[PDB]
Structure formats: structure tokens, C-alpha cells
Amino acid sequence: GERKISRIHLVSEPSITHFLQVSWEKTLESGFVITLTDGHSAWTGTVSESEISQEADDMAMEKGKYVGELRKALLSGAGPADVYTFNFSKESCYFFFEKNLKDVSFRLGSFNLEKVENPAEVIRELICYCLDTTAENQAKNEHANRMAAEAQKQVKSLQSLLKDTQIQLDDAVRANDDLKENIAIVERRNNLLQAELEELR
Amino acid sequence: GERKISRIHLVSEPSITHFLQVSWEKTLESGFVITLTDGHSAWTGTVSESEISQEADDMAMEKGKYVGELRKALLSGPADVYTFNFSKESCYFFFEKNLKDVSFRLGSFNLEKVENPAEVIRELICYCLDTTAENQAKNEHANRMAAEAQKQVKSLQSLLKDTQIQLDDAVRANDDLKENIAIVERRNNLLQAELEELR
């Protein structure tokens, strides 16, 4: 499947950066695993397709749009706009977040995240993912750069060749115009000469 | 400065991944800070310029070559060329280079256990997220440029062929025209000749 790891700010624990890892198979709508960690402990919960539907109708908003909101809130980086606000109770292990508008805010979602017994394993796997992804993109970046450089050389050569050929074509066209002019002239002369000869014979 | 985070396996804990974070100003030779973590605890030590030089002379190895070995061992080849050992009791960390039929001690330093491992780990994760993001963007951009350039190549090739077909056709047409000009001009010459004979 695929995953997105983001920096998150919890109102309840405001002085340190927390990390939110969300993973899903093909789409977020199919359901997803959501993990929260502070670099020491880790809380994990699973949200099902039906639970997404449930949360969507509790707010009387269309399911698809709600999934879009889930994407913007959970899968992106929270900017200065402060559109979304995040809270987590370590007692109830309940994770809830609001959307902020002008002059009003409403709860956009909430889920239970069970404290894991193996936080270090989760953290190691997370870091490993980041390392692997970096490596993969670095290799792909080199190949892409190789291909780009090669293609760019070919582009310059092809530009030159195309231009030269275009010039030759223009020359040939002008030549063709002049030639048709001359054939007309010479054929007209031929008619007149035959005429002269016939009238004199 | 600079930083490199690498995945390593400790001989004492073979199935568990540890992370080695090495940071240095301009070169590894200047000295470096090294942190080891298992995602729960963290150990940190500092290696000085002089300590590197000393260890190099203790091994009767040339300074540059030893620094090169340190780079390959700590910042970077075939699997398990280098092997890592750490005692959590004595906080003694040593690493060897392994060859066929021989292995030698490459380096060793003391790492004090930090009281704030979570803070260290969070900072490390933050760095990883940034680097991952940067390379994702950089790769994404690179693919855009590559795809664009290759598309341009194909389009130009196609366009070149079409233009070179048009040119060939135009040239042949001109050939036929010049052929005809010659023929009719010959006829005219003969006709003028007749007229002259009749004058």
C-alpha cells in the first residue's frame, strides 16, 4: 500500500512536535491505519470503510467530500492557515480534530488509538521507511537526470536539423514557383512560334 | 554542517535495527558527533580530530586512507564488509572491517546514554521527513524534465521526417519541371531555326 508521515501539533501536548503516520491500500476511503507517536510511545488505531461512512453521515456531509477533508487534515502539512486543529487524550486514547472556519469550528473527526506495546518497533519501521524512500528517490533521480541530459543533446541536434531542412524546403518552393513561371513562358513562346510558321507556310 | 543517518545491525542484537547518526562540519577528518538509537534509547559520543589521527597512527595507516575507511564504515558496498559492536553496559562501541580470511578493528569510541532519548529521536525523525520530502520533490521535478525532453525529441523527430518528405517531393517536382523546361526550350530552338531558314 502507501503511507504519509506528517508533523502534527497537539493542543494537549503543545511544546513538542508529534508525528502522524497514515497508511492505506488504494484509497483513503477503503479505510486506513493511523498512528501517533512522540518518539517514545506510540498509539495506533484502525478506521474501517463503514466507520468512515458513519463519521461522514454524523456530520450530514457527502462521503466523498468528507474523505477529501480527511486527506487535507491527515495527509498534508498543517500550514499557518490553522485550518485544522488536533487533540489527543492519553487517558482515553482518543484522537480528535476540528476544522476551523471564520467565526466557527466543528469536530471533523475522532478515532480511538490503542497504545502499542512495541513503540520502538513502530518508530524504527517509520524511520526505515523514510530512509528507504529517500534512497529510492535518489536512484530514480539519477536515472531521470541521465535521460534528461541525453534527450536535451538530441533536442539541440534535432532543432538544428529541422531548421536547416525547413530552409531547404522554402528554397525548393521558391524554385518551384519560378520554374512553373518559366515553363508557362517557354510554352507560350512555342505556341507563337508554331503560329508564325503555320502562317508563313 | 552535515549529517548522515544509516541503518546498522549490532552483533549482540542481530535482528534489531539500530540507527547511526554521524554529524560533521566540513569533513569527517575534522571530528564528528555520533549518535546511536534503537527507537527507544539513545547513546551519544564525540570523536576529535586528534583521536582520529591517533587511531590512524596506532594502525600504521595513512591518514587519508583511514578517513576514507571511516566514511565507508559510518556514512555508507557489499553487505557486512563492516561489522558493529556495542556494549550497553560499558557503553563501548567498536567496529571492524571484514575481509576474506581476516578482520581488523577499524575504530572505537565511548557513547554516553542520554537521559532524553525521545527528544533526540524526534529531532532525527524531523530530519528524515525533511530529507525524504526534498528527494521526493527533486525526483518528481527530474521526471517532469526527463519526460518533457523525451517528448520533445519524439515530436521533433516526427516533424523532421514530415518536413524531409515535403522537401523530397518538392525536389522531384522541380526535377520534372526542369526536365520539361529543357524539352520545350529545345523545341523552341528548332522552331526558331526553321523561321530563320525561312527569312
Which of B116, B137, B159 is a domain's end point? B116
A56/A46 same-domain check: yes
B107/B161 same-domain check: no
Please report the residues numbered 106 through 165 in chain A whose beta carbons come closer than 8 angstroms to any beta carbon of chain B. Answer: 119-124, 126-128, 130-131, 133-134, 137-138, 140-141, 144-145, 147-148, 151-152, 154-155, 158-159, 161-162, 165
What letter represents residue A16's amino acid?
Answer: I
SS3 B39: coil
Strand partners, B198: none
B1: exposed, middle or buried (C-beta count within 10 Å: 0-12, 13-18, 19+)?
exposed
SS3 B44: strand
A66/A44 same-domain check: yes
In-domain check, residue A91: yes
A18/A112 same-domain check: yes
A124/A114 same-domain check: no
Strands (E) across B82-144 are located at: 82-87, 92-99, 102-110, 112-113
A101/A133 same-domain check: no
Tell me the technique behind this structure. X-ray
Strands (E) across B38-184 are located at: 42-48, 82-87, 92-99, 102-110, 112-113
In-domain check, residue B180: no
Strands A31-37 and A84-89, sheet pairing:
unpaired
A100/A128 same-domain check: no
Pick from A179, A197, A174: which is nearest to B182 by CA? Answer: A179
DSSP B89: T
In-domain check, residue A69: yes
State the smallest CA–CA distance between residue B61 and chain A in angstroms: 32
Nearest CA in chain A to B125: A127
Q: Can you give the residue range of the structural domain that contains A142? A: 119-178
Long-range CB pairs of A156-165, under 8 A, 24+ apart, other chains included: A158/B153, A158/B156, A158/B157, A158/B160, A159/B156, A161/B160, A162/B156, A162/B159, A162/B160, A162/B163, A165/B160, A165/B163, A165/B164, A165/B167
Pick from B2, B21, B7, B46: which is nearest to B117 by CA? Answer: B21
B121/B94 same-domain check: no
In-domain check, residue B34: yes
Angle at B154 between CA B149 and CA B157, to 5 degrees: 120
B79/B165 same-domain check: no
Upper half-sphere CA count for residue B22 (Cβ side, 13 Å): 22
CATH of the domain at A131: 1.20.5.370
A144/A58 same-domain check: no
A95: exposed, middle or buried (C-beta count within 10 Å: 0-12, 13-18, 19+)?
buried
Angle at A33 between CA A32 and CA A35, to 5 degrees: 140
In-domain check, residue A107: yes
Q: How far apart are CA A84 and CA A116, in angstroms?
A: 26
Pick from B91, B83, B28, B79: which is nearest to B55 by CA? Answer: B28
Q: How far apart are CA B129 and CA A126, in angstroms?
A: 10
Per DSSP, the residues of A115-183 read EPS-HHHHHHHHHHHHHHHHHHHHHHHHHHHHHHHHHHHHHHHHHHHHHHHHHHHHHHHHHHHHHHHHH
Selecting from A131, A186, A196 the residue whose C-beta is nearest the C-beta of B185 gives A186
Q: How far apart are CA B94 and CA B85, in angstroms?
A: 5
State the smallest CA–CA distance between residue B165 and chain A in angstroms: 10
What are A45's three cell numbers? 488505531
Per DSSP, the residues of B14-34 read EEEEEEEEEEESS-GGGEEEE
CB proximity B191 to A under 8 Å: yes
Q: What is the tally of helices (H) and strands (E) in chain A? A: 3, 8
B2/B60 same-domain check: yes
| Most distant CA atoms of chain A, gap in Å | 126
B3/B74 same-domain check: yes
Q: How far apart are CA A46 and CA B102, in angstroms?
A: 50
Q: Are B20 and B6 in contact (CB under 8 A)?
A: yes
Question: Rounded to 5 degrees, what are φ and ψ at A14?
Answer: -75, -20
In-domain check, residue A172: yes
Among left, alpha and beta (phi > 0; psi -120 to 50; other), residue A9 is: beta
Resolution in A: 2.3
In the block, residue with C-alpha cell 476511503: A29
Instruction: Give me the number of domains chain A comprises.
Output: 2
Among left, alpha and beta (phi > 0; psi -120 to 50; other), residue B31 is: left
Rg of chain A on CA atoms, in Å: 36
Question: Rounded to 5 degrees, what are φ and ψ at B68?
Answer: -60, -45
In-domain check, residue B199: no
CA A45 to chain centre: 27
State the smallest CA–CA distance between residue A75 and chain B in angstroms: 13
Q: How far apart are CA B85 and CA B35, in angstroms?
A: 14
CATH of the domain at B111: 2.170.210.10
